[PDB]
Design a protein around this nucleic acid. Structure first.
Lengths: 50, 363, 135
RNA sequence: GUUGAUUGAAGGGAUGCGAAAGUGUUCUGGAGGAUCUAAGCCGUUCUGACGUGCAACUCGAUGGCAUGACAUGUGCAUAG
RNA sequence: GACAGCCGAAUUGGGCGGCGGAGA
RNA sequence: CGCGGAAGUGUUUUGUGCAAGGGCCGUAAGGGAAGUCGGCAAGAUUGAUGUGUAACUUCGGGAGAAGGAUUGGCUCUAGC
RNA sequence: AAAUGCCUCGUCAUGUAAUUAGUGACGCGCAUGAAUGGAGCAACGAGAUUCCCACUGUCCCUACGGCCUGUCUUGUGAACC
RNA sequence: ACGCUGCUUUUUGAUUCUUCGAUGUCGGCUCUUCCUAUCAUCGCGAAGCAGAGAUUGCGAAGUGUUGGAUUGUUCACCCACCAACAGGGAACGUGAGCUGGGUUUAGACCGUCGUGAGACAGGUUAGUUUUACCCUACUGUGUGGACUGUGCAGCAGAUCUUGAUAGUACGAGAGGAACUCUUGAUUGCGACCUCUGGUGGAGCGGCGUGCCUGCUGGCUGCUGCGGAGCUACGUCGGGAGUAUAAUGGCUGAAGGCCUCUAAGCCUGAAGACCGACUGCGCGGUGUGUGUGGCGGAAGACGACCGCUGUGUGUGCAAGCUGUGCGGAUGGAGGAGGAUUCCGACAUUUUGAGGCUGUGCAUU
């Protein structure tokens, strides 16, 4: 069973392992780990991470 | 004097004194109540703890109650249970001082793992069998058998020295209990012949050890404020002037963990064999019952296993005793399992079935 | 007459006494402060604390001069602390927000800004009908 | 015996306004028991350490003062 | 032919002296 | 000065590996003084260069008021 | 109602959800008051007080980690009572 | 009402029996235990008890009784929540447990009093908190097998709520319940690490200061991610046993009637006892222990759990980091005849290099 796809890295997330974050516009982005939420906070572009 | 602001006391006096256990295989304190209008069966078993995992489950409510079907994710424990061997019979009669044990019947050939437990590792340096069978039939208010485990089938323990116990036999007609166990000496009995799915069970074992611990951890008392001289991890007042002695109900520092505990009402979820594919799930893949990489600090499960809901006392590779319920049980809700997780428990595993990892990278 | 509060599964609590929350309806207020939680029974030294769905007793720190210097009721709708759902997933919002209420349970405003959790929407159906998004 | 900086008084130059009386702007110069920092000197708080001590008054962090109504070696004068 | 509610034999009001029980 | 290096000078070669509790320190979800006699303790601000600076006032001050912005490496241009 | 007011947590206003605190105003002031100096705060203060922003393990409620001690060895080997 | 009789030892007095070759003197914070004259929760009476909401009484001490503003305060007084926010004792419990705000010798200011030195239970500000390594008590630990019996000691869960019952019984109306079933939680207790969060002087990367002549590679400083293990802010888990109290009843005299009582009997509580659960001594039995060494799931040291050569090393699996050196092709521009040199950084070879205490195999 899959929970969803990571919105930063593009990889499948297993059932029970992500955190949904809802924004003020009603948009709920799904991320896998703190390695990924940090790259979003610093405003890095995912295309510069191989 | 009279103390404004009352609060509950910290910890329970049911379990004081808090000493180490004197044994790694505690014996059960009671056995269920015999109903002699049933067939003959056993009331317990011994297994070994392996590790924990997931499961997703469908909460059957599909009537038009406002919530038809929910999903529920539950944690489980796996125990590895090879079959046991019977090698003896025991009877107890009733006297004015209680239960008196009668002489014992041994089978024909006692194994080499039962002789190391009885006489140590250096132990290698008839009609009287028939007369003792008559006593357990005339006398003997209740009957028990002597069973032993086979730890050499799980080569990650390294034992060769078996655990042995006495288990009560339930089912009526004391002469029927005896003849059922005479046709079972020296043979094996498997865990699927004792427990069944969706039943409540008891466990008995020893907890994880922690050594000598301070009083903030052993009992849960408050820390002192930051300005305090002579340390902050402690209790401030240990008594009144009178009585001019310290009481047994005061919190002190000492041994924490490695205690004997009995837990009750654990629900059985699955019963299978490790050397085949787990199924009854609603997904297609094969998936044996063991994660990618293996159970951490444990090998693989290759014999029979049993799966129960929730936490289970003790450490990995330690022996546990399983007992049938002593209470009254109602039904048990209908159980529908549809997924069992088998990712890696080392790190954050994201694949099931290593062939699925192999097809992601290509090469 | 007491307000009935429907059942709700266990959640981690994120709001405590002294937290400043944001007002999410067009009633005139801007900032609220929590001074109490309903249904709190107590424990020595433990502060009363709330999760989304709970009713709080608030004081208006910023807004219309009519509403100030009194005690009000409010429902909590968002929090920034993570909580777990029973299907196994986790979720969080971006701010802490609440909405003002009568002594019988009716909203004071007519509009509500932002999204709302699915838990809050079944306990309080009149809030469901005025929310722009549910999760 | 006393390091490196900060601020910019009087005096002096140039330039603009105005009938006059007068006044704007900006350079130069280097005053004051004027502001920090160093060699160093004290002793605010932690009611910190220590409290048969390293020690019959010390140790750590934090803070105050550092051109003086200063600090310090040595000759002389003042005695119950 | 009482007392009690035709029946057939005892019924009852005040006190005193020991004993026991509430108040505790 | 602090943070690092020379010169000169001083120095040993078969104790253990780390329970509780101490002395001196480091990192913490969500909340943000609800703690306490008392923000005690800790955290926070910090160099330089443009910008922008109020009440009051002994007209000297207040003033570095407050508040906002910029800062690395590389390759060149302009002034004396 | 001041480092000076017994009665006293004086009375009214203002800051708080809630003010024996703070500030403003009132005055028959147990016992204010003029070099016994009175009124008065620009500049200066490791002086005494109350509030605001910022900030945080002060606290809700504690967790995990570092070095030196303690725990264990050999040598030297006291005191209070 | 007017009068009269008691009990307690929580007030403040009255007294001066003990201690002046010294018993640390207020409050708070922390922690344990006891009392009942019961505030709530369980059972049950009365009514000027229709229902709802309260008022008054009896059995009952098992479990609970909170968070803040002002004051050093005890005390007091308000705000918010609550099933409810009862009252007391333990050297006015508790300073080799802390703190030191009150009180608080030696500095100082004000008011009143005194010729003065000085005085004031009048106000204000600044003012050292020493020592256990002894005996006992208490907490663990040790005091030499395996399987069990049975005595003693300890003892745990408590309380609220959603829907239905039902707009029903009751009531002129307005209003407005209960038994039984059912949903979730708060707090206490005992465990556990699959998930999520915290930590992580293990490991990999980035950016610097000094030093090894520069590049490569090192050492030193700051920083991002961060497995295992530990942990909570995360996950799991509760008898329908026996006899009774208050009260209400059955049969029934004394006393031809009456009566729950004098003989007997039925019912009945968050209470009692027992069970289950944890610890210790003593018994029994076809039953008596690996000197040493090495490991761990165990551990301060002793002990406990295992084996009796199956380690170490290496490979694979499963993870963490994030695209290695060298080469080749480029690069804002600058220098100048060679078509040369200087240059941060870019793309490619390359999910690439480095690392691992976990699992499997082999040597």
């Amino acid at each position: 069973m899959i929970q969803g796809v990571s919105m930063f890295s593009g990889r499948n997330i297993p059932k029970g392992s992500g955190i949904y974050e809802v924004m003020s516009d009603g948009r709920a982005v799904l991320t896998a780990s703190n390695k990924e939420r940090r790259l979003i906070a610093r405003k890095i572009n995912p295309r510069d991470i191989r | 004097s009279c103390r404004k602001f009352n609060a509950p006391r910290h910890g329970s006096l049911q379990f004081c004194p808090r000493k180490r256990s004197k044994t790694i295989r505690p014996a059960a304190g009671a056995f269920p109540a015999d109903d002699r209008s049933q067939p003959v069966h056993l009331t317990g078993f011994m297994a070994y703890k392996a590790g924990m995992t997931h499961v997703v489950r469908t909460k059957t409510q599909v009537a038009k109650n406002k919530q038809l079907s929910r999903e529920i994710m539950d944690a489980v424990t796996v125990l590895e249970a090879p079959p046991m061997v019977v090698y003896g019979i025991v009877g107890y009669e009733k006297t004015v001082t209680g239960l008196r044990r009668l002489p014992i019947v041994t089978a024909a050939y006692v194994s080499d793992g039962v002789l190391r437990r009885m006489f140590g590792n250096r132990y290698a340096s008839g009609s009287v069998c028939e007369s003792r069978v008559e006593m357990i039939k005339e006398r003997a208010h209740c009957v028990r058998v002597l069973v032993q485990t086979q730890p050499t089938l799980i080569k990650g323990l390294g034992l060769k020295k078996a655990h042995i116990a006495e288990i009560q036999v339930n089912g009526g007609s004391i002469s029927e209990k005896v003849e059922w166990a005479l046709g079972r000496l020296e043979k094996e009995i498997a865990i699927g012949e004792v427990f069944g799915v969706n039943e409540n069970i008891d466990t008995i074992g020893v907890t994880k050890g922690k050594g000598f611990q301070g009083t903030v951890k052993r009992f849960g008392v408050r820390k002192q404020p930051r300005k305090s001289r002579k340390g902050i991890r402690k209790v401030a007042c240990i008594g009144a002037w009178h009585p001019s002695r310290v009481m047994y109900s005061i919190a002190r520092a000492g041994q924490m963990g490695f205690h004997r505990r009995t837990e009750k009402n654990k629900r059985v979820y699955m019963i299978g064999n490790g050397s085949s594919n787990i199924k009854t799930e609603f997904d297609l893949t094969e998936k044996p019952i063991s994660p990618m990489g293996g159970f951490p600090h444990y090998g693989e499960v290759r014999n029979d296993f049993i799966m129960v809901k929730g936490a289970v006392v003790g450490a990995r590779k330690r022996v546990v005793t399983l007992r049938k319920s002593l209470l009254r049980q109602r039904a048990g809700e209908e159980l529908v399992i549809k997924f069992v997780d088998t990712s890696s428990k080392i790190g954050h595993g994201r694949f099931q079935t290593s062939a699925e990892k192999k097809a992601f990278y290509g090469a | 007459k007491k307000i009935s509060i429907k059942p709700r599964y266990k959640m981690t609590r994120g709001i405590q006494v002294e937290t400043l929350m944001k007002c999410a309806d067009n009633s005139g207020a801007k900032i609220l402060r929590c001074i109490g939680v309903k249904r709190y029974r107590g424990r020595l030294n433990r502060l009363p604390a709330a999760a989304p769905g709970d009713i709080c007793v608030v004081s208006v720190k910023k807004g219309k001069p009519e509403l100030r210097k009194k005690v009000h009721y409010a429902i909590l709708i968002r929090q920034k602390k993570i909580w777990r759902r029973t299907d196994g997933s986790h979720i969080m919002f971006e701010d802490n927000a609440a909405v003002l209420i009568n002594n019988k349970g009716e909203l004071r405003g007519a509009q509500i800004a932002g999204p709302v959790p699915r838990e809050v929407a079944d306990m309080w159906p009149k809030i469901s009908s005025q929310a722009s998004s549910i999760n």
